Amino acid sequence: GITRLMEDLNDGAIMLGGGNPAHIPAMQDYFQTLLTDMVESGKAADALCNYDGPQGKTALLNALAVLLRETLGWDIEPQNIALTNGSQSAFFYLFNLFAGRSTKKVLFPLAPEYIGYADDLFVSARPNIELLPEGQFKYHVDFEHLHIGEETGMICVSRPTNPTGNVITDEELMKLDRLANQHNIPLVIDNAYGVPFPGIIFSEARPLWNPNIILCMSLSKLGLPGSRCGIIIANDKTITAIANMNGIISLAPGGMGPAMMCEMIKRNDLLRLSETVIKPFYYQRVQQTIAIIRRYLSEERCLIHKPEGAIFLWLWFKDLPITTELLYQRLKARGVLMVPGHYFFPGLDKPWPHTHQCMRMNYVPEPDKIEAGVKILAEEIERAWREG
Amino acid sequence: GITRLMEDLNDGAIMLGGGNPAHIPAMQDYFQTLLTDMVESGKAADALCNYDGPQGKTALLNALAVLLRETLGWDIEPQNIALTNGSQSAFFYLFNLFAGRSTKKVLFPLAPEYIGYADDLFVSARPNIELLPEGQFKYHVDFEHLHIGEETGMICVSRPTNPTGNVITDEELMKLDRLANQHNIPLVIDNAYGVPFPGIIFSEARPLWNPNIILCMSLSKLGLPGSRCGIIIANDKTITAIANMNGIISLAPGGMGPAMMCEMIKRNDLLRLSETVIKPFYYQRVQQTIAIIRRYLSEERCLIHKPEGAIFLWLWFKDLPITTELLYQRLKARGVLMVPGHYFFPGLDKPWPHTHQCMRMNYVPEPDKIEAGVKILAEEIERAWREG
Numbered sequence A, B: 001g002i003t004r005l006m007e008d009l010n011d012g013a014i015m016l017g018g019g020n021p022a023h024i025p026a027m028q029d030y031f032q033t034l035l036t037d038m039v040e041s042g043k044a045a046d047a048l049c050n051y052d053g054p055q056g057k058t059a060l061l062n063a064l065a066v067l068l069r070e071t072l073g074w075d076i077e078p079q080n081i082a083l084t085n086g087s088q089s090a091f092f093y094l095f096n097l098f099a100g101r102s103t104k105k106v107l108f109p110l111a112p113e114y115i116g117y118a119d120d121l122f123v124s125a126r127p128n129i130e131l132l133p134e135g136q137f138k139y140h141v142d143f144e145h146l147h148i149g150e151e152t153g154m155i156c157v158s159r160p161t162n163p164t165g166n167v168i169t170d171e172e173l174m175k176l177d178r179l180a181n182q183h184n185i186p187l188v189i190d191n192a193y194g195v196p197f198p199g200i201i202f203s204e205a206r207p208l209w210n211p212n213i214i215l216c217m218s219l220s221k222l223g224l225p226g227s228r229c230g231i232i233i234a235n236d237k238t239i240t241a242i243a244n245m246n247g248i249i250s251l252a253p254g255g256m257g258p259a260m261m262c263e264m265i266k267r268n269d270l271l272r273l274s275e276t277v278i279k280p281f282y283y284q285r286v287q288q289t290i291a292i293i294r295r296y297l298s299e300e301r302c303l304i305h306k307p308e309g310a311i312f313l314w315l316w317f318k319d320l321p322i323t324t325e326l327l328y329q330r331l332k333a334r335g336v337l338m339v340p341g342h343y344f345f346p347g348l349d350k351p352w353p354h355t356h357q358c359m360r361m362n363y364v365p366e367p368d369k370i371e372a373g374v375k376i377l378a379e380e381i382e383r384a385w386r387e388g
């Protein structure tokens, strides 16, 4: 299933099934100038020609520590930070450190989640659904049926979330934090899209960190998908354990990402760009894309998860009389690619027809491409309701 | 043991225990000019700001294929090439693909090897020893006692080798190639230091590739230890399997390495620099370092593995009356770090005192540092022979 999807998603197509960020003109200009300065000062060469240069992993651990300490008041030191090749390698280490053979599992208390899609070890909890105005909706943690036991090795959430754009509420997160502490297991939060960088969040969300939290951050959604710089923030024992693993599997970041981050932090540009350039760009783009969708599909044929952050729209074709696996084939035959939703719910205790009524799209591509894709989508949704 | 070593090797020290390449002035100048051109042309920004840009993984697979096809006559296509974060992530995938649970093992037919050091799954064969002039020696495959069975998942060698600088002979390699084929298992060759790049080889060695060979190459020893670009050359089925894994664990390379390689290949500089700048630099440096050693230690107190390639000298303190684990502590107390040899022989069928009489050093650091380290080494060797 996923292998074919990956093949399709690679091999005038309207490609709305990917996870790459936008090319924001102001950001491209910023990076071009930054790179020009760094090459001219010798810093680019230092980054590539040294295993751990003056702006290497070590300088960055110090810079990130100072940044988080001074901007948010978090008691972080370099010993609380580890760097990886990206988000996905970060989770591979965590899963190995806390899950597997007693045999422990990773609990996703608020499915759907992307890492489950990307990678018997995963257990997804079915979320509650809150219907919202304008044909929107929001998933919630169902605490009444949330099962955490001796076999749970870690609790994992993202904020904001790929694929829904959901932002788990302060109350939900604090409850999960209390449960994790009570069960002596870590609460892992994927912050690839959140604050302080890249800041692709459109809703309220109080930041959270304490020694029982493992926080994953990344440089890629800043508009540097070609750099490979994942960041893990955790208690020093966890960081030490991660140190060892990265030493063996060797999925450390290259030098250019860390060097660029050091420079952006030094110039006091990292937070500024996230809040004043990146966030507004995506907020406008998500609003424009919803408006395009609504010209073709009402709430009677498409419910949209409230877009609280990240770069996706999660579409729920409520009561669609065919599956989105079938819809996907029909769209593909017409040159439109989106991701079937079922793939983001691995490990549910019980099957749920809902998983076959959703799809994920990326709202970043140019609007003419978005509109052409949406027009075809609406035609296929109409066809399904008319004739199966 | 290894954890402490790693801590020591990190935490006016004479650090001869690392594996980083030299900073060759002509190469630093070359990279500075190349980076300047790439930033000015937009290519650096393209590499970092795109997940798979114009000089991304795809352009590089094509470029490397054309390079190997036209320079060596190898029937390689892009489907025979996979990119990784480096040598070490490359082997993690291979070990997972061919070894482990029947349960299969990785055979090192010519120990000592570095990947065994870096990472019940490994079996090392004891090599034969050939004494050579000038107090040198060379390890050889002991075919008479080489055991390959149903439980062998793959055969793994490097050429030239970390930690010895050994270059397995054409005859030894062809025999291993025939054995691998006969047992229907791959022959994996780590070419991090060999031809066509970076070309840090000082002996004859006929290149070898056929569909049952898996060849690992890297950009780091070209003098780009901050880039993260490992290359695997293998039959398309193997490459496809590796594709999947890298998709999940996500240890793909960042964009800058591949982009720089594409540019060097396009400019016809990659092979030229390896043969005319890199190789002669290291050849002179290895000869100079041996001469320094010989001013302090004769063949009666230090045998040196014939330096046939790579960036290390492997020292055998023949019949030393203390172990090199103990010698290491004594050197460390005096500010000199080298690697105890025992760590490069995991999985020997039988213990071998020889493993406790060797050490690895890196001959790249500046000669004043080399000489200060060697002087201390000779004093400690003399002390051991005089008083234990």
Ligand SMILES: [Cl-]
Binding pocket: A037, A038, A041, A043
């Ligand atoms: Cl600069």
Ligand SMILES: [Cl-]
Binding pocket: A134, A135, A294
């Ligand atoms: Cl509406």
Ligand SMILES: [Cl-]
Binding pocket: A280, A281, A282, A284, A285
């Ligand atoms: Cl916009």
Ligand SMILES: [Cl-]
Binding pocket: B037, B038, B041, B043
């Ligand atoms: Cl250029």
Ligand SMILES: [Cl-]
Binding pocket: B134, B135, B294
């Ligand atoms: Cl001599």
Ligand SMILES: [Cl-]
Binding pocket: B280, B281, B282, B284, B285
């Ligand atoms: Cl030289």
